[PDB]
Each structure stands twice: as structure tokens, then as C-alpha cells.
Design a protein around this ligand. Sequence first.
Ligand SMILES: [Mg+2]
Length: 1074
Amino acid sequence: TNRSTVKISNVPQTIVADELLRFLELHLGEDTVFALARVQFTTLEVKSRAQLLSSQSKLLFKTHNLRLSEAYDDIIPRPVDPRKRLDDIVLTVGFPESDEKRFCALEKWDGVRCWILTEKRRVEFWVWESGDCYKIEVRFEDIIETLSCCVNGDASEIDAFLLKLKYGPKVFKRVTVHIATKFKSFCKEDFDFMWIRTTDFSGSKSIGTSTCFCLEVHNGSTMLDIFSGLPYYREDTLSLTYVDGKTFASAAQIVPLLNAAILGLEFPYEILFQLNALVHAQKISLFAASDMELIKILRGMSLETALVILKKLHQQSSICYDPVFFVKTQMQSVVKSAYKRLTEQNIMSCQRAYVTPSKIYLLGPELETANYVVKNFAEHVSDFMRVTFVEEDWSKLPANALSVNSGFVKPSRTNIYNRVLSILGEGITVGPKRFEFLAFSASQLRGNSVWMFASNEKVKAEDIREWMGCFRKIRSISKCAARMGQLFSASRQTLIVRAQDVEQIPDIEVTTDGADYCFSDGIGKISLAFAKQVAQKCGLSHVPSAFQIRYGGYKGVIAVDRSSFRKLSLRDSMLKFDSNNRMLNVTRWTESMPCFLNREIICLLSTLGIEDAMFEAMQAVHLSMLGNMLEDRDAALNVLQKLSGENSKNLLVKMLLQGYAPSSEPYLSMMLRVHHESQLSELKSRCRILVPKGRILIGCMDEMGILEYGQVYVRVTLTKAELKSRDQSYFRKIDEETSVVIGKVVVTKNPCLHPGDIRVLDAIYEVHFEEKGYLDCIIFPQKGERPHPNECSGGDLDGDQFFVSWDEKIIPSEMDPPMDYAGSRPRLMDHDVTLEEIHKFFVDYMISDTLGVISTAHLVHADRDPEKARSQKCLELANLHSRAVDFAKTGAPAEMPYALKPREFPDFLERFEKPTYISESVFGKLYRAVKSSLAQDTVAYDVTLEEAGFESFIETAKAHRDMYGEKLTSLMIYYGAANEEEILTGILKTKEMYLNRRYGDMKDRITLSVKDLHKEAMGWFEKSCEQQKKKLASAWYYVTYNPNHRDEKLTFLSFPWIVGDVLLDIKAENAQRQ
Ligand SMILES: [Mg+2]
């Protein structure tokens, strides 16, 4: 259980490893030590002797006794069991070749060293091909099936062991250190060198192509090993014969899992995009689809039937070894909106890919939200391809994989980085279509994902870059990335603006304290008429006070000024790039966003001097709200409406506002329980402890010079809770639904890492409120020593959302001096920017450590210091986070030093695979309070007679369930695993990747949204419309099918919910008569 490694107690600084072994000779057996305050022994049997002798205190060195402390991690991972460290055995890789018994031996390796580590979920194979020792770490979770095979004749039936893998292994390499090996405080088996993640070492590239591992164990008496530790072991044995897999060798490092060029004119959009996807998903083996018989059969029939049958094949769980038989069964005995829907529903049928470190995993055409480039190029939607780089497990690609990071002396990019660069340059070659790099978005860059486009005959892969307005005369990499990503972020197209309508005004600057500072970085002003026009254009009945635009090549948030008459009044400080597209791209406007704390904000507030036990009251209110949602109607407009982003448009809001209790309708109860679990998990992970007073407002300013330094104007549309109890010491009446904050206000940005970004400004009143009309927006001052948005980390008014809360409970008494926040030098290079440069920028971001790890390092280092956030390590982490944020402007990757690495994590963070310590120091009580809170009927008549009491008896709901309920079941079988019949962006219990949740939920959300819309489209098509005999009849039929016939083989509970708006409206109308 200790892996033969025991941590030592306090030791003298002049401890000698060599003398320790000689002393250990007089203390234990001969050569019983494996590595050398931690000491690792050769066997676990002598550990008990060592542990017992430690209590006797016999060992001593230089008048300082040494004790065996609690068990820690092994110095070098070797399995305690001698028989678990198999040595000098043979490994083969391939696929079962359509028969479960013919292993396609892609490559044979002899001398493989197998280490079946049991305490840690990992299986290690060491391959010494050529002169490099390349480790193969299978990992327990990867294994989908382990089998005892019979490679030889019937004698010695258990002669080989076969491991069916799904995600593929992690391949490493050994590099010389050329440094001293002792360093006082020491292995004995020459375990030098380090593991750098590397692409497949096989020339034929078998490891990528292969989906199974067969181990040729010398003896069959290894039943003790290869057991329930190795997942999915069935006692049934199978006789395995080897074949020749030389026809599957591929020398192209790109896409090492695709077929060959043995196809005449087969359509790739319906076969190659599906057959290869099936191979990657392991529904059919590579030979099962590369055989000429299946290819010819698939070419035989039309593309629609082929796509349907291949989708049905993908719906299967286990491997379909003989797809020819399946296709014959579903074709001979077949029993037998639009592609250009981007302009109508903005949903893409993207051919997303997952380029792992040593493989390719296409996920077929999955429906997702569209974007501007494909919105225009919808004629060639099948040609686009979203390529995401992952880590052989669909998780975030570690910075250790793409770079050595930390004694290294100089960062040397690993072979995975070169593979990423080559696969970006040469491109993905899926048959006839060869996908080339086009561009990426900012969030797309965060997602480790790239957009690729193939050189089509009508449109070339280079012409799209010409159309998008990038890579023509761009001088810096940062502005090239900004231009590439500006038109990819989700934005809606407003009205077109005249070129002469925009009227530039001088940028407001102060230039004090040495560093140059600009007050209005991205603050423009709209005329009232144009503001109204863009209000209808966006879809708002009122006039928002500020709009975050992307009009032209200039990005920023532009307010509404009733005094000015200029149409747009563009700013010169908005300098991003130059473009001729004079169309406003409004992304977000000013909402009264309900406020919610983050862990970094809590840490900074506690550091500044806010009582730690004072946040616990706000979380107590939060958990009182959360615990009374499955039993009380108070959740109707308190949890779903406020804590979750659901607005009044949600069906649950309708059916709770005027409907029954949370425990009445089983569908309502299940949805509210889903929300309960989601909110509890969020609060436990991300301490979104809602502050009732205060909001996250969009940073703006008033161009009229009244507001002074330390003064802010904040107007908020009061919530219902604040409307019921208004007129406090912090609010001042302005209208029936609005009030201006008068008390102290604390302001910080969303990251809020460095202690001092917390600026407790003064909220004041201006007589010119009717002159300006600023609403739901934080008005920063125009004059002063330093711009207030610059104080909040390195923020600026480019559309930033600034934290505000008026509670004296959490307001600091004092400020800490903020950082300089020096601007990023553009560094306009003469060499222009090429595709290779932006590819290098992408790979450099791959190397750069993400903001999440820096934030969690700051949090972990902030709980064990006399000063919570003012610690020196916290300051270095804050500066490094500033550098990482500025990386989008300066091509300098952010590598976190190993000194700031979190060696052990608190219990608030569920980092189970790491040392864990209780965090009773600083806001650690929040996690355990959340844990304590967490660890504490026929309705057919009501659904039908109270809303559609007329006897419909349409009975079309049975047919709908036969096609829409079956569709929901198929959609759930595609990705879901639980009984969530109406997921609606619900968090599935299974988390294969995690680390991707938004992308993973989007696949479930978009499919559920489309299916409900498809059911609504099916419902509308089946509806004959007055809609009394059609809509009410359909609602009543759905209610009868779901609620009255729940015992039937449907188990939907949500088919009436798709049309639930009509049912709820009818119930509300008929509440008078009942
Ligand atoms: Mg910004």
C-alpha cells in the first residue's frame, strides 16, 4: 500500500545517502533499499521491519534520531508486487479484424517491460525501439476490456493477455541529463532522465492506428494480476491468431487513423466522414471498414440511407465486428430542416476533430452554434472543420506535453509541439479534402481548437483569409490574432453605419505617475436616435445605456449620449485593426446582472481585512435559498430566475410563477432537482455566494466632467426583492424601478487576483442624471490621478464587467496600492505576419500555462500565510497572471516556476489525485458548510382537464412518441447515460473529459434544443390551426400519453413539456372554470 516508499522524519542537513545504505545494512537486509527526506526500499516486506524498527528508535545518525513518517508518493513509480513488474515480454498492437480472434499485428515489440501499477491507475510498457526508451502508459480508465487470449494452440490456454483500449496511451521518451546523479539527498537502478511526451515512435505509426494491446506473458499463472484492478475482465477466454497488418502502415504523422487511397469516387461527406469516425469511436475496426466488400456495398446505395445506417451503427455500444452483416441486415431487410439552415437557425453541422498527441478522433457532423465566417460560407459548410488539440483523453493538453517547462535551462519544445505545428501547416488530409488553417477565435484559442478549411474548387483556402480581412498588411501578431478572432465571437449584426457618420473625438489621457494612462480606452457615445435604432436591431424594447460593439475594425463599448448628435462617435483609443466592414457587431449590452462572488474576490476581501466568518452568513442565506427549492415555491423567482441565468422565458418560470408546487409535477420536480444539484455543485466548486445588494455592471463613463477621483455613479434597476424593501441608507429613489447608489461601493474586475484591485470607490449623485440617462452601468470618473478601471487588475472600459456591491459586510476599510499595469508594446515587426507566425503563436499559447492553474496556485498559497494575499509568492503569481492575460497582446508564453507549483491542495478543491490538507484558515469553512448543507401521483387530469378539458382523443401523441420519443431516446443514447429524457443543457452524471464542460454541454444542449424544436415543428406540422382544435388537442394528447400512460413503453415525461407553453396558457385561461 506504501509502494515500498516511506517518508523520513526530521534529518540533519548533512545527511549522507551512501552512509544511509551502509547504516541500513546494520539496520535491515542486504541491498534492500531502492532509492534515497524520503527513502524507498526494494520490497514492501522489509517496510514492516523498517516501520517496526523506527518505533524502537534503533536508527540514529549524528545525535539526531530519524523516524519513519507517514507514507508519501514514491520517488520513482515501481509496483510493490515483484510479479506485477513483468520483464522481457512481447507486445503487439492492432484491431481484431472483424472476427474478435484475428489480431492485426501492426508492429511487434520484444523486450517490453510491463509494470502493472495497482495503487496508481496506470499500466506501463517500456519499448526500446532504436536507441530511445519510449514508455507507454495505458492508464486504467483507458482500458475498456481486458481478455485472456490463446496465441498458441489449445495447450496453455491462457498464454496471451489482450487489452482493448479506447483513448490511447501516453508515449514518452528518455533524454540524457548530463548532470551529477547523487546530489547528496539517489536511485540504484539507473533511473535517470525525464519523461517528455512524444508522438508515436513507430515508423509505420502502429500506436496511433492500433486500438488494442496484446501482451505475451510467459506464464499463465498470473491470475492474481490482471484482475478487477484491470477494468472489465470477463472470465471467458478466446483463442487469438495473428495476421499481417502491413497494409495498414502509414508514414504520414497527420491523421494516423484514417483509411488508404483505395476509393475510386466514394463520397467523403457521407462515408469517409462516417467510416473513419466509426473507426475512431471503435464501433467498427479499421479492417472492418477498409475491406473492399463493405466499401462497395456502401457505394451501392444512396448517401441518405448510408448516412442513416452509419448513424445507427454509431448508436451501438460494443464493437460491431462485421459491419457488412449489419449493413446487409438493415438494407436487404431495410424496412423503409435543410443543410442551409445557418441563415435560418444559426446552427452549424461542423465536422469537429480531436487531434490527440498521437492520433486523430473525428466526431462526425454535430450540431452547434454557427459563426459569421461559416454564416457567409454556408454554401461550403461541409468543408469547414474545427480541430481541437487534446491529450489522448479528450482533456486539456498539459503544458508539460507541448514543452519541457521546469532544470529546463532553456524551454525546448517537445516533439508534440512540432507535431502541432506540422499538422497546422501541412493540414489534415481526409481523403480528397485537405483541410488548411484559416483562423481561430480568442475563446477558440482557450479551447485548444483551430478552424480548418479545405481547398475547394470554387473557393480556395486562401481566399477565405482575404474575405475575413486578415493577413493582408498586418504588422503585429497580436493584431492579426485580434482580426482573426473578432468576427468569430458570438455577435449579432446591427445596422450598417455610414463611413462619414462616425465622428472621432480626442482620446482622454492623463499620463501621470510616469506610466501613460488613458481614461477612455474603449468608450464611445451614440446619439439617441441611433441608440433607439440599434435597440430595435438588437431586440430590446428599452434603450440600453451602452453597447459592446465591433463596428469596423474597432472594438469597444459605446454608451448613449442624448446631448450629442453624432451617429456613432467612434474613438481613436479603440485601435485594434482597419477594415471596410462598416457594420455594427453588438455582442452584449448593459444588463442588471445579478452579482456573485468568486474565490479570488473572496480571498482578496479576506486579505484586506474582512472577517472570514462574515462570508459564511451570505452563504448561509444562499444555502437557505437552495435548500428550500425542492419543498417551497420561494424558488419560483429566487433560484432559477436569479442564481441561474434563466430569465422569464423559461418554461419552469411559467409553471412555478402561476403553477403548482415544486413537488407536484414529476417533470417539474426532476428539473428543479437538476437545478438544485447544478447550483450546489457550482457553489461547492466556484463559491458563487450571491450578494443581494450589488451587481456586475458594464464599465462606462460620463463625458461630462463632474465625477472626480474616488467617485463613481452607479444606477441599478432594482430587483423584486429590493423593490419590496426599498429606501435604505445606500439607495436613493430616482424612478419607480430605478435607484442610484449613495453609499460606499467596492469595485473589482472578474479575475481580481492581485491584492489592491479592490477599489472601494464612493458612489455619488449627479444632478445631470436626466441629462445623461445612464442606467445599469457603472460610470467611472473622467479626471483624476489614475483611471479607476485601470486599478482593477489591468482592466479597461472595452466592454468589461466590473464587480460592485454596496454591503458594508464585505467592504474593505482600506485599499492596497495597485500595480503599475504597464501597457503592452505593439512591437510592429518589419517581417509582416505569415501563417507560420500565427501557428507559432498558437503553439506558444499551448505552452503558456492557463489562467486556471495560476488562480488555483494563488488560492492555495493564500491560505497558509500571515498575509493572505500580500505574500511574495502571491505577488509573483499575480504578476505572472498579468503576463498571461497580456499574452494575447505580447507573444510571450507564461511558464509558472516549479517553486510556485502547488505541492498540496486544500479540501475546498477536490484535487483528489494530489496531497490534501484541511483548510480551516481562510474561507475554508465555506466548503464544509456547503458539504453539511448537501449532506443533510397521477397528474393527467390536472394537465388535461384543467387546460384542454375538451375530449380531444387525437391519439397522434402515440405516433409522435414513436418518432419524437424515439428520437429523444436516440439522442440520449448518442451522448447521455442517465435517465434525463429532457436534458436541456443539463449536467450529465458521466464526465469523460471534464477539466470542455461548456463544449460538452453544447452538444447535449443543441441536440435537445433542436429535438424539442423538431418536435415543435412536428407538432406545428401536425397542427391544423384557431388552434383550439389543433394546439389544445395536441397538448391534451401529449398529456394523456405522458402522464396517463406513464406505464407505457415511452418513459418520456417531457413530450407535453415541448408544447408546455400552450398547456400552461390554457391552464391559466381555464383556471377560472377549472
Ligand atoms: Mg478588456
